[PDB]
């Protein structure tokens, strides 16, 4: 998902110019000015990788939001850093499950968002209340106002 967005936002304009020039050199002679799903799939075939057209459509739907089938500058960098998955295994299931079970200090099976507030105060990153609101929206799938254990698994699924 937005994992590659986070990774490249950690990165700087060096990657921007690097991938721009890489497009200039390798995609030289193209008529579209971007990279298409079929375009990248044929490129993979040319180099020797064998992706499938269904996988091509899946990946382009994942990277393309506007439905264009190509890559915006930020989307282009996200896809370029996407093809390699350096970070995997996303923390540990059991330890984080214990952390979440103790997160419910009231131990009622439900997460008070004030506990989330205090934990975030501990985190202290530059964040507004709407940011944690959006994060909960990302996490509170059933919109119950708390953090469900299964939804806790979902939103932390694969999170390093």
């Amino acid at each position: 998902d937005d994992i590659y967005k986070a990774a490249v936002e950690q990165l700087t304009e060096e990657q921007k110019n690097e991938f721009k020039a890489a497009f200039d050199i390798f995609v030289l002679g193209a008529e579209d000015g971007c990279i298409s799903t079929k375009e990248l799939g044929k490129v993979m075939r040319m180099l020797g990788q064998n992706p499938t057209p269904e996988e091509l459509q899946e990946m382009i739907d994942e990277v393309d939001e506007d439905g264009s089938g190509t890559v915006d500058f930020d989307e282009f960098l996200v896809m370029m850093v996407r093809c390699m998955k350096d970070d995997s295994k996303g923390k540990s299931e059991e330890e984080l499950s214990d952390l979440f079970r103790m997160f419910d200090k009231n131990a009622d099976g439900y997460i008070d968002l004030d506990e989330l507030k205090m934990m975030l105060q501990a985190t202290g990153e530059t964040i507004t209340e709407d940011d944690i609101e959006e994060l909960m929206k990302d996490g509170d799938k059933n919109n119950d106002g708390r953090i469900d254990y299964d939804e806790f698994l979902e939103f932390m699924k694969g999170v390093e």
Binding site: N50, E54, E55
Partner: protein, 371 residues
């Protein structure tokens, strides 16, 4: 470490590391010694080309498959194929990787025992496990019930499964498969003048079958139409020119599946052995098996088979039950995808046949608890 999910098959060896989507290396399983004399000196001519190399030099070789019908008839050639698969197509020494072979149902014991003995003595793997080719194809569909018809190239078998409990008394294994269809197509092509005899030209007939043949929805109507119009005659260019035109041989070759009397086999088609396999099951799980009929294997890739089979079963089955035929687009590699999923499971990690166990009980360990 990672596990090697090999899948011997009969016609195409599919292998790759556990946890991926598609096999890493897929290549025909043929070993062909040269047959002519050879006059150039120092050309570096080997004594046996295996795998995909012998599909390019097939003009001067005598290709011979080492697996006839599921069973293995020529152990030296099979050992050569495995050695090639490990060292040149994957380039991973087997001393550091578990292996997960696959085997058809109802096969001779000696075949399986020899397979495990080879894997433990020659290649010296850490641990290997043998699995039935249909349970994997059921894994890949993400189901847990259903009756799977895995019509490979060697043998067609039909294993029904409910709630994870396989029914050993309802497995119907039939030995008609892709190879017999290739031979029958090669035999009916002679009715127009094209004669293919050499074991190398069997590959050309196989390519014709793959690219042109299709399964007719209704056989008699197609036979009548192809005998009046000429809208079916599709042409094909041989490896040297001289295009050929296939008429009503197009849907007569794969029709043998539903009428095995064409090649002289007595048994009933794949449309009726599935219904018989269902009817042997208990009376309370027949609805679920009717609704979750799964297709797999290469030979079930004919264009228009998922409709003919559904029509036939709906004709046979009671009118109230719903008949649904699951035909995923990734049919050919369904068994291997299921094998990867099974090898990637944590619960399965203690079912491997560890080498010390083999040292204590001999090759007959495979029939024991570690199945």
């Amino acid at each position: 470490t990672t596990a090697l999910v090999c899948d011997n098959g009969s016609g195409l060896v599919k292998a790759g590391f556990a946890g991926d989507d598609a096999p890493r290396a897929v290549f025909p399983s043929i070993v062909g010694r040269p047959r002519h004399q050879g006059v150039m000196v120092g050309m570096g001519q080997k004594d046996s080309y295996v795998g995909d190399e012998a599909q390019s030099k097939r003009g001067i070789l005598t290709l011979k498959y080492p697996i006839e019908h599921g069973i293995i008839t020529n152990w030296d050639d099979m050992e050569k194929i495995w050695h090639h698969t490990f060292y040149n197509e994957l380039r991973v020494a087997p001393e550091e990787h578990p292996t997960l072979l696959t085997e058809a149902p109802l096969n001779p014991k000696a075949n399986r025992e020899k397979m495990t003995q080879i894997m433990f003595e020659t290649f010296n793997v850490p641990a290997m496990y043998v699995a039935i080719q249909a349970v994997l194809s059921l894994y890949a569909s993400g189901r847990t019930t259903g009756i799977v018809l895995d019509s490979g190239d060697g043998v067609t078998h039909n294993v029904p499964i409910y709630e994870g409990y396989a029914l050993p008394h309802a497995i119907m294994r039939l030995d008609l498969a892709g190879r017999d269809l290739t031979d029958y197509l090669m035999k009916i092509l002679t009715e127009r003048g094209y004669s293919f005899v050499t074991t190398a030209e069997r590959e050309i007939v196989r390519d014709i079958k793959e690219k042109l043949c299709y399964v007719a929805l209704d056989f008699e109507n197609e036979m009548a139409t192809a005998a009046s119009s000429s809208s079916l005659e599709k042409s094909y260019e041989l490896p040297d020119g001289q295009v050929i035109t296939i008429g009503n041989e197009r849907f007569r070759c794969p029709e043998t599946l539903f009428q095995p009397s064409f090649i002289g086999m007595e048994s009933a088609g794949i449309h009726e052995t599935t219904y018989n396999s269902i009817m042997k099951c208990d009376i309370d799980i027949r609805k679920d098996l009717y609704a979750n009929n799964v297709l797999s294997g290469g030979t079930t890739m004919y264009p228009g088979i998922a409709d003919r089979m559904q029509k036939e079963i709906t004709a046979l089955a009671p009118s109230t039950m719903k008949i649904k035929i699951i035909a995923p687009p990734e049919r050919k590699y369904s068994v291997w995808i299921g094998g990867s999923i099974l090898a990637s499971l944590s619960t399965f990690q203690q079912m491997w046949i560890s080498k010390q166990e083999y040292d204590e009980a001999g090759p007959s360990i495979v029939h024991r608890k570690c199945f």
